[PDB]
Symmetry: D2
């Protein structure tokens, strides 16, 4: 048949005040506090948030002592949960702790599992446009509250971005922007719309440099359903590792299923994901392709990956195959868990910054896995100039 429809692709983000991101953030704050004092701290800490209470749960091996309830109440306060009026208060909320405890170049993976990494040309950050934009809107929505550019806002928020795509699977036009924010009851829906349209949407669209993808009719949906007066843990339970697609590539890329936050870099779910980001970004910035995705997988006890899979979605260049690039990857990168930590210098308190507004393509941060410092070595292995 002749009817065609336009393909729209969507990615979402959430603020630090979303109860899932609260948990990812408390988990990574506890990890950081421990690495500050004992860099070799073994840490797998789940946070759960429900009305009035934060549960801290999981396994720690450490020489340090850290005041977990103070870490929790303080992080809740930076986030902005500082009264019962806004629905949660760091100073007066519950904290419950249930923690217990159950290197070598060739020391094996602590678990089996699969981990994916992705990079693309479409943005300077090497990040797909939909999630990059969704993240920018969620960062900005927190910023205009914290710097007091828009008054009456509260920490809980979600953003969503839908883009029109050409037949070649390339971004073409910004179609639909959704922003839902928590706020005071003294503020309505019309006032919020002009505030966020001005100070968040129009602002990010300029700062991202995409004003040529945002001409004509754009559907803008601001708080399109219900009064977002209360939020965070009040009414809506949060857990660590329930925002893994927000954490990554916003659905543009595949995922091995493992969460990041609350895990020290010994956990291949976290460090191998970061490694695959590193490998992928270096594949693309070395001009071996426009888009690259790399899976790795491990067996518990074994140190050499049990698997590695390169895909460039027909963006391959210099008449190279994915099997050829992958050979180069094996030649350039060392993917034993203990080597990745050495290579990316991961034994440091840098994780709390990654718990909200993405672990990848972070221009506001300085992440070891975002370094494009293996491009030359890749080009050499493929006999390129």
């Amino acid at each position: 048949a002749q009817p065609t429809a336009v393909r729209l692709f969507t990615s979402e983000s959430v603020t630090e005040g979303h109860p899932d991101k609260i948990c990812d953030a408390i988990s990574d704050t506890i990890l950081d506090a421990l690495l500050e004092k004992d860099p070799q701290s073994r840490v797998a800490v789940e946070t759960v948030v429900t009305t009035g209470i934060v549960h801290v749960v999981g396994e720690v091996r450490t020489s340090a002592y850290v005041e977990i309830p103070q870490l929790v109440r303080n992080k809740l306060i930076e986030i902005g949960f500082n009264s019962s009026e806004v629905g949660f208060d760091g100073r007066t909320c519950g904290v419950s702790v249930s923690i217990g405890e159950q290197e070598d170049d060739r020391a094996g993976a602590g678990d089996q599992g699969l981990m994916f990494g992705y990079a693309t040309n479409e943005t300077e950050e090497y990040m797909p446009l939909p999630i990059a934009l969704a993240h920018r809107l969620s960062r900005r929505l927190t910023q205009v509250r914290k710097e007091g550019i828009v008054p009456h806002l509260r920490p809980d928020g979600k953003t969503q971005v839908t883009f029109a795509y050409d037949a070649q699977d390339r971004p073409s036009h910004l179609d639909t922007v959704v922003i839902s924010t928590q706020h005071d009851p003294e503020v309505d829906r019309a006032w919020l719309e002009t505030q966020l349209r001005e100070h968040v949407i129009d602002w990010v669209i300029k700062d991202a440099g995409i004003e040529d993808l945002a001409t004509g009719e754009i559907t803008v949906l601001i708080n399109p359903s219900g009064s977002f007066i209360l939020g965070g843990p009040m009414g809506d339970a949060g857990l660590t590792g329930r925002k893994i697609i927000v954490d990554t590539y916003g659905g543009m890329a595949r995922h091995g299923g493992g969460a990041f936050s609350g895990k020290d870099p010994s956990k291949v779910d976290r460090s191998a994901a970061y490694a695959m980001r590193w490998v992928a970004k270096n594949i693309v910035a070395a001009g071996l392709a426009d888009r690259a995705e790399v899976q790795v997988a491990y067996a518990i006890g074994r140190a050499k990956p049990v698997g590695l899979y390169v895909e460039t979605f027909d963006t391959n260049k210099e008449g190279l195959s994915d099997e050829q690039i992958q050979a180069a990857v094996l030649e350039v990168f060392d993917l034993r868990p203990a080597a990745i930590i050495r290579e990316l210098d991961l034994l440091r308190p840098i994780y709390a910054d990654t718990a909200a507004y993405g672990h990848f393509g972070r221009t506001d941060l300085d992440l070891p896995w975002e370094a494009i410092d293996r491009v030359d070595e890749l080009r050499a292995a493929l006999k390129l100039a």
Copy 2:
């Protein structure tokens, strides 16, 4: 110039894995509530750690269910019936923090708005009878057989917690070509010699699945088999290993072969777009491959809170489109044929029934053991019709 073999991996876990225990407890509560009150609103999270199950979230129902009894019964059925195994359902702790009894159905009205924003992906492939990718299909079969040989006593001394992993060598046109690596880690009784377990699992679990799945054609020659490749697995489940609902969404879907919107399925009633739309996309994709419009299809959908019609939809067929149709043409057919408003999905697929507990382990998709409404090939004729075909 030199070349590497591309190797793809997917994993599964048994119902005894602490994350799957949470998913199963969450979907046992959902089922129990839908049996008494099909319009129940349920967003129920389970946490497990040493000695204790926490039940947490939002519930709006006219029914009463004994959560602690359901929790203990599920654990005893899973196999956690003793402190010797590391967790006993009869003696475990159960804490319940649930509210939202109205104090703070549109799912029936088809013009009713999504309950939240979000993205959802569905996928299908003619690689298997169940329209599923081989890696996850094999991993799920291995995890199901691991639990099966224990509950039926085909292999003695086994315990509930376990993990399975499958790696396949892939050709240059992204097709599976050979089984390369199989991993099976299982909780077990202390009096077991690895060699006896290695031989038992090789014969009763791996070899059995390779025949049941009909892939001996892909399992010739040298296959790497790792069984309990690390340490001793005597304690398992929540003992020294925290579990949470929604921490196995890739195992619950396509094993990394397809994309994902990030939402969990267990603990959520069909009014949750995160689950209903993902089941819908599985339906749309399976009906696109069953109608021979492609060999593989991936469909994404997205919604805005308070809005019935999706904000977006994305059909990919990975250059496998047939009948010389583009992906923009198959999508035109999809919109003509499928009602993707949430309320319409719930009705199209008759979702207000207690059928969710069985999905909480071994996958939501390609379940020939079950009869799930989103696995039905019942929209093929309508799709081919709107594509001026038959």
Copy 3:
């Protein structure tokens, strides 16, 4: 010859805002709410409060459903904990619930072993010791003053204490010291409170009590004598059901069995026997058979018949009656089998939330069945008295 030291006896009370009473009140709100819907409900509900969280634990058999989290949040709003400013808000607090256990009629045995004590004294019209009676009146008044606006800037958590000088006959003589620590808004000074509480709490209560003939001379008054009482309730201060048994009973003037009252349905002999034994003691003192009377009863699990009973009048017996003699009189007038006690006092009704602060006994402001002076005739008669 050898010098004498005036004997000084103390009793203490607490507001509904004290974290331990928060727990007793919640436990008894859940009990009342189950009996409102089902009078045969079996209830053994413990409450724990700590920073931000109420835990409800224990065992129930009921045919009814009760919204525990709402009863809890509501009962914190009434107590006055309705903001993070005060250190606890019922609307945003945590609630976690771990409850389980999904002549035969009077030959029904008692659910447990145990000892329970009952006391009466003619010192007061409510037949309560002077010190715990005054104590209760002080903490009741401290709450009333905040909830009616008589004193502003007050917060719910508070403790009152009362020490009395006594004669050589174990009889009260004078009020030596009243102490009153209260929570308050940080916009207030101890000096302002000292005068406001002395006026509107201590002086009002000394009058309302009819105790001004014991009020003369120098009274030592300690008002917020330490630190600043700005936060209270569960903030920085763990609370548990069954942690205020002496405050709930006779303030140490009488003996105690050990059993908590709150969170227990009347089949729990810990409660129903102590209620019975208040009733007997009160009827002994109102019968003119002694000025002070204390009775101990003990049960064995499974046996309806008490295994022990022990009347004591501290040598204040009247009409030449021995304790043994009064004790045989009690057995004749009083069915002290669990099931009888329930029938006698009509306990299967929602009347316990009220008992959870300010005392279980001598409650003039209530209508408690165990406070009924209605076996006076049958006690006299059985003793050949007019």
Copy 4:
């Protein structure tokens, strides 16, 4: 000539396995573990125990770190909760922790709180304890001895003992009337088997050990597991908290109580330190020939190191024509009841508390407790001009 009835007075105790004494014991294991490393540790810890879970709660200020979960699981195993079989297992139960609050000197050490506390002593026994609570503690202690030493098999840790005594008209113990014991057991035995094993190896062994054969003549009504099957115990279906056994911890109802718990409180809490002191005061009043039975009440205001209350009562057992007021005068001169002085007088900054968490805090001949030393007799008499 109206009819008489004999007066019957009762006391109870519970084993270390009773869910409430679990909490007290765990709370005092934490206190000890902290005093062991920091003697100035400020500890206000509550334990809660329900099916499968121990909640540890309250306030602590210490320079030390202790592995609370390790302390909990081990205490539960020592008690004998070491299996899902017996209804709770130390090795696999939950542990959740919710703690926080990281001119004369002894005059500025004012009381932590307001509160009344009570002390008691009596001639009736070698350990200066009333007869009922003394017998109940020995029965409950015996009831765990025979399990731990394999003297009576098929026993589990949960356990309750009650003791009723006939009283003569002068409020004095005449006859051992009724003994209750309810013990947790394996299914491999029944009420009848226990009936005879507990009689021979617990009850009869204790009557001889306590030397009350002359109270033990005639017809003793002995009720043993009188009701239900006691197969599962501890927290399995029965919530325990710290501070819900304060009368078993004291004198079994014979004496009065101020209503403060002991367990999980450091000696800076007067609820604990004053009560211990008051036992010490009363046990010296009685051993100094000054009386047969002595009860003393002390009371504090928060901020004030000087008691706001003192009350000596000897129940007309006072000797040498001395009034209660005169005995009180000497008590004041010989005893410093300021909180800091009590801690120093009895050396309370030591890990000695887990042993008081069961079987009584007073009259404890199996232990060596500061507040049990009769070492103020000579001084008290001197104050009354005696020899």
